[PDB]
Amino acid sequence: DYRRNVGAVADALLAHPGPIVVLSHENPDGDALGSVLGLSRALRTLGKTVLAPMTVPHYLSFLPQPGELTAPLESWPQGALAAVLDVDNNDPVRVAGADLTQFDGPVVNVDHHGTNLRRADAGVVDPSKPAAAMMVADVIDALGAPWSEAVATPLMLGLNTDTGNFAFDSVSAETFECAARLRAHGARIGWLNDQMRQNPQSYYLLLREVLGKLEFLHGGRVVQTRVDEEMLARAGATWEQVENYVSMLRNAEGAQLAVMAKDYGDRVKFSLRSRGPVSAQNIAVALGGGGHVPAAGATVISSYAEARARLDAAIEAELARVDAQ
Amino acid sequence: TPDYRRNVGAVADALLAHPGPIVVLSHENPDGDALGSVLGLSRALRTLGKTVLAPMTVPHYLSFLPQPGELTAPLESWPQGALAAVLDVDNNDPVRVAGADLTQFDGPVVNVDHHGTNLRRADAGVVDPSKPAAAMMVADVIDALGAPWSEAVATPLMLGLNTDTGNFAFDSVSAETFECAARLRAHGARIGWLNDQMRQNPQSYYLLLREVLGKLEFLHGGRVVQTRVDEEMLARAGATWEQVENYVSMLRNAEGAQLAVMAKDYGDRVKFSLRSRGPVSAQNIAVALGGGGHVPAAGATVISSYAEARARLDAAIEAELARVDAQ
Ligand SMILES: [Mg+2]
Ligand SMILES: [Mg+2]
Ligand SMILES: [Mg+2]
Ligand SMILES: [Mg+2]
């Protein structure tokens, strides 16, 4: 069925005579941007007219060339087809650059999220692939293989970012084979990573702050850090940059729990990473929230001291969880 | 290539045919490729019933990878009838071969290496600088050995592949590099565990980073980034001078910067590491302080206090930028 559906997506794209609007999810990541650019370039080499509305984050701005990605679409072009990647088309609120609730043309979808409703004129959803870019590569082969370096490179970038440079346990042998194909097509791995290593002054100044509120507590097995808007003002950064430090704190030794705490002032908004025989969703269901399986995310509308005490009690609760299991 | 496959075959042949002990060696201060290649070949050779000694000193950050008592201390003499299997280094470069003294040995030597400077002289050998990790080539040798594959063999070879390619990020990564990773992963290489263990940072790392970042400085409008580390900072952090080595690179990553400078202040002298981009020559700046190097990567040791040294480094920086802009 994977093969048959990759084929149906590609056939629908090949058969479409009008413009093709290529879309991904709001706040696009490397997989989103990379899948949209790879598919867009492949379709343009075949002579398709493509619109790709997307707001490029700065750390990814080296990749698009002028006029490849546009501002959000005012209105849908006549005879358009929508190719939605790395997100569910049945979730318009999460699809950025065009409003799918105002469109009635054919819709095609390529996604690797298990939450997908699996409803489109032609679609392929495969949670066992760790990046939509892998799936888009298979579509491009099914389109007639319009390969070039310009197509391969953005797809390799999305393979990279969605697997954390081939570090996550989602990486299968098939993931590596796809990277081998992409490299043979010309993907510029060295250039990609020289570009992805660049960091703004904001990053360093904010990481000086983030580390300023760091403590190795619980006798040595839990780490905790904290960020306020003054710290953001002194670093010259934004709140969407604090989401690059909880990963580094999970990496601490002799520890089990790495807690980030965003302190807007009138509420605390947590990100609680962990590792080992400790779960971080038995603290996100012990003070409320949502997420994925090992992740977390809980908002306490109190001030700073109180929310942290609530969190510490929930952590001793996961501690009894460990003492029991 | 037939040459490559013939030499892989000759190396496996010499290993299978040898009746006595096989001493498996790599270079001093082993990296992930050295340890991972030594462990993969040693484990494979043991499933074929061979007597293997693997003398190696493992650095702390890699000590998760060997089984306890899998490696030995350096050999103070050679077992009778031994063969030396030298990986990830040239056997004609004995100073760099750690764990045994190859100038005292004249039994059979086998070599598996991927550096171009290798003299290519061994009783059986294969050198291929187009392979980005010796662990790739060791995997090919294990195929030619006929040894049973398993997670124990595949996992250490996967680490060497990771560490020598920078997690598949260097320009040396080829299609066949990824084809090798796929094959290792299919054999059970524990990719998640490996990257967990490689990102296990002691408290010292974070404290030292805070201190280093505490002295970070952006100068000349972002073009120049600069910091330093002294003994007080290492005392406060519980850190070593060794841990001050991944910092000149994290600084070169600063956007808009054409020059990164790290200064190590030992009380009586200051060692400067300089990296530059675009038109800025780190060499000219280093030569002005008494040092030198390549155009984008240079160094100098000034025998003074940090204050005196910094003033002279600022002066040398101003001249270089002034030359660049006047061009
Ligand atoms: Mg995404
Ligand atoms: Mg994705
Ligand atoms: Mg090496
Ligand atoms: Mg090597």
Residue numbers in the entry:
A (entry chain B): 10 to 334
B (entry chain A): 8 to 334
What's written in the study?
Members of the most radioresistant bacteria genus, Deinococcus, possess two DHH/DHHA1 family proteins, RecJ and RecJ-like. DrRecJ-like exhibits a preferred catalytic activity towards short single-stranded RNA/DNA oligos and c-di-AMP.
The full-length DrRecJ-like protein, free from any substrate or product, was successfully crystallized in space group C121. The refined DrRecJ-like structure comprises three protomers in the asymmetric unit, with two of the protomers forming a dimer and the remaining protomer forming a dimer with a symmetrical protomer from a neighboring molecule. The crystallization condition used in our study contained MgSO4, and we observed two Mg2+ ions bound at the active site. Two catalytic metal ions (Mg2+) coordinated by conserved histidine and aspartate residues (H34, D38, D40, D95, H121, and D171) were observed in the catalytic core. The second ‘H’ of the DHH motif (H122) was not directly bound to the catalytic metal ions. This suggests that the open state of the DrRecJ-like protein has very weak affinity for its cleavage products. According to the structural data, dimerization of DrRecJ-like is mediated by hydrophobic interactions between several α-helices (the α7 and α8 on the DHH domain, and the α10 and α12 on the DHHA1 domain) of protomers.
